[PDB]
Design a protein around this ligand. Structure first.
Ligand SMILES: Nc1nc2c(ncn2[C@@H]2O[C@H](COP(=O)(O)OP(=O)(O)O)[C@@H](O)[C@H]2O)c(=O)[nH]1
Lengths: 426, 48
């Protein structure tokens, strides 16, 4: 019935979704050769949400591989769970956007987008009709914010009422890899604010802080960081694949979290997250799942949520648990953190319980929540944009590829007033 | 990497096991009281 077409673009999108399909296959008992093992009825009655029958009993993902240089597409196929993907769902580029939003969107992203609208429409119309699209990409590099951003654009007018999940990583405050950071951010946030139903914010140092202060892992790899995001983005869609006492889909997450259609930027958390040496010392019940839940270190968003106001929050609980333990724990963290929640929406908090837990854990919970504490990223990318736009720095790489700079000021306009609307709600 | 075995079960299939039916065979037996006499006579037949 419900069907989620996963779309992943750029090097970071393909790498982060290799870990996504790694945990979905593990959760659903899928051998990397496509066959099934695990003799449980709860594994396979909802498998069309992410997979498809392929007249051989094996399950191919509904994943649209996208990259504009063939570098990481060879590595994602050669890795474990790499032969699960259909080779036709890959789309190959030959030049590669060199961290350039301009040419990745206008002059050479135009010829590859015709061959990939063939495959996203193939997956859309193959079923009876779908539920939503989830797009994983970068907003700091060129092939993610240049190419997948335009893909996000034209899938609106062809499927307007469909839900658009999207996970995006952002330019970082402290370390600045990909030296043209704010240009690939500001130009794509303009598109994303008017062409995405809901967007979820990931930061690289927020992932590094989770891997350091909560996981106590001395050596973080990019597969380790991708595992954290991938575990979070399976929890946001547990109830689509497994039953529970209180079910919710992406549309339930949408209608409860966005009151005004223009602000849809969310903070993501994941619990539990124990150290490898502190797993056996720490209890596992709803009062401590919900108290690690509202911690600044717990988010994969690098903004302090005490600096803003929680406009709306929600929690996808997972595992067998008391319904009124969940009820008592949301109400306790409202009326004790009274200054942290906005006043004019009574009981800002939403809950859903997915009865089947993730593997190896008795219970878990995933955070999706709109906060006005995301504003300090929008002005941080903004003043970094205008400090080097005022000096005409690195504009010739952009304006020579087909861009004119009239959307540079009006992206600044259409992002400084994101700051303005997020301001008065605290 | 190993494949950890799937332990997952829902509230319906844990709580709503087919229950043993109650053992009911108990009617309400009532005993009819034995009939009372008609030792009753009229004045005409007892005096005349
Ligand atoms: N979350 C995540 N971020 C990554 C990964 N690999 C690289 N990055 C970040 O992405 C930035 C460079 O992105 P880039 O490769 O240009 O994105 P592209 O547009 O898809 O090519 C760097 O600052 C890295 O911190 C990954 O596997 N996961």
């Amino acid at each position: 019935m419900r069907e989620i077409v996963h779309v992943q673009g750029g090097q970071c999108g393909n790498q982060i979704g290799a870990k996504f399909w790694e945990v979905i296959s593990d959760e659903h008992g899928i051998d990397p050769t496509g066959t099934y093992c695990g003799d449980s009825d709860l594994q396979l009655e909802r498998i069309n949400v992410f997979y498809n029958e392929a007249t051989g009993g094996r399950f191919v993902p509904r994943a649209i591989l996208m990259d504009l240089e063939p570098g990481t597409m060879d590595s994602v196929r050669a890795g474990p769970f790499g032969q699960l993907f259909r080779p036709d769902n890959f789309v190959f580029g030959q030049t590669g956007a060199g961290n350039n939003w301009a040419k990745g969107h206008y002059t050479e992203g135009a010829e590859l987008i015709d061959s990939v609208l063939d495959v996203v429409r193939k997956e859309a119309e193959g079923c009876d009709c779908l539920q939503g699209f989830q797009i994983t990409h970068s907003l700091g590099g060129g092939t993610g914010s240049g190419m997948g951003t335009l893909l996000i654009s034209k899938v609106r007018e062809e499927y307007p009422d469909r839900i658009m999940e999207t996970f995006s990583v952002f330019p970082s405050p402290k370390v600045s890899d990909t030296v043209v950071e704010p240009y690939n951010a500001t130009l794509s946030v303009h598109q994303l604010v008017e062409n995405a139903d809901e967007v979820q914010v990931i930061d690289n140092e927020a992932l590094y802080d989770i891997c350091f202060r909560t996981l106590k892992l001395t050596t973080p790899t990019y597969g380790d960081l991708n595992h954290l995001v991938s575990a979070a983005m399976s929890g946001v869609t547990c109830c689509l694949r497994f039953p529970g006492q209180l079910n919710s889909d992406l549309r339930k997450l949408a209608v409860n979290l966005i009151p005004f259609p223009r602000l849809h930027f969310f903070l993501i958390g994941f619990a539990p997250l124990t150290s490898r040496g502190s797993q056996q010392y720490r209890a596992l019940s709803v009062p401590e799942l919900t108290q690690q839940m509202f911690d600044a270190k717990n988010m994969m968003c690098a903004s302090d949520p005490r600096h803003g106001r929680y406009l709306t929050a929600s929690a996808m609980f997972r595992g067998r648990m008391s319904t009124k333990e969940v009820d008592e724990q949301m109400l306790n963290v409202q009326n004790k953190n009274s200054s942290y929640f906005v006043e004019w929406i009574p009981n800002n908090m939403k809950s859903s319980v997915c009865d089947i837990p993730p593997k190896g854990l008795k219970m878990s919970v995933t955070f999706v929540g709109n906060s006005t504490a995301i504003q300090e990223m929008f002005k941080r990318v903004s003043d970094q944009f205008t400090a080097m736009f005022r000096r005409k720095a690195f504009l010739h790489w952009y304006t020579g590829e087909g861009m004119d700079e009239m959307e540079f000021t009006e992206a600044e306009s259409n992002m400084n007033d994101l700051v303005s609307e997020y301001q008065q709600y605290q | 990497p190993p494949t950890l075995p799937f332990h997952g079960e829902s509230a319906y299939r844990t709580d709503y096991v087919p229950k043993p039916l109650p053992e009911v065979a108990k009617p309400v037996e009532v005993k009819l009281p034995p009939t009372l006499p008609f030792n009753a006579q009229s004045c005409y037949r007892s005096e005349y």
